[PDB]
Amino acid sequence: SKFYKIWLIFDPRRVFVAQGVFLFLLAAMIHLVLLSTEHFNWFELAAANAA
């Protein structure tokens, strides 16, 4: 298609910085959410399996 025309609308430098910040904050948030639960907290599971 013609999705490439977005770079005529948005400056590549500012988008790349924008998603670089957004993607990490995305990655940090989901990783933290899993750590908040009991079933998906891999730090507590490792302690649990150690017994």
Partner 1 sequence: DLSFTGLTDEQAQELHSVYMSGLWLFSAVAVVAHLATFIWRPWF
Partner 2 sequence: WNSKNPTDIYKPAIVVGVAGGAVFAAALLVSWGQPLATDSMQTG
Partner 3 sequence: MEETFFGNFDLASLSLWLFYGFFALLIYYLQTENMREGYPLEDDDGNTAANQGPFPLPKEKTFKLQHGRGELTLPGEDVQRRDNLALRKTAHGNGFPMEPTGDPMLDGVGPASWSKRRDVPELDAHGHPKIVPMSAAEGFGVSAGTDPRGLPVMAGDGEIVGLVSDMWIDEAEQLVRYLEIELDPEWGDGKRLVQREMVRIKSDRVKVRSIYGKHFKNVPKTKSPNQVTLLEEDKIMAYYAGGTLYADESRLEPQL
Ligand X SMILES: COC(C)(C)C(=O)/C=C/C(C)=C/C=C/C(C)=C/C=C/C(C)=C\C=C/C=C(C)/C=C/C=C(\C)CC/C=C(\C)CCC=C(C)C
Q: Which residues bind partner 2 (CB under 8 A)?
A: 11, 13-15, 17-18, 20-22, 25-26, 28-29, 32-33, 35-37
* 45 lies in the site for partner 1, by CB under 8 A: yes
| Contacting residue, 6, 16, 17, 22, with partner 3 by CB under 8 A | 17
| Contacting residue, 11, 27, 30, 47, with partner 3 by CB under 8 A | 11
| DSSP classification of residue 6 | G
d(CA 31, CA 40): 10
Residue pair 34/40 in contact by the 8 Å Cβ criterion: yes
Query: Two tokens at 24?
Result: 């990490």
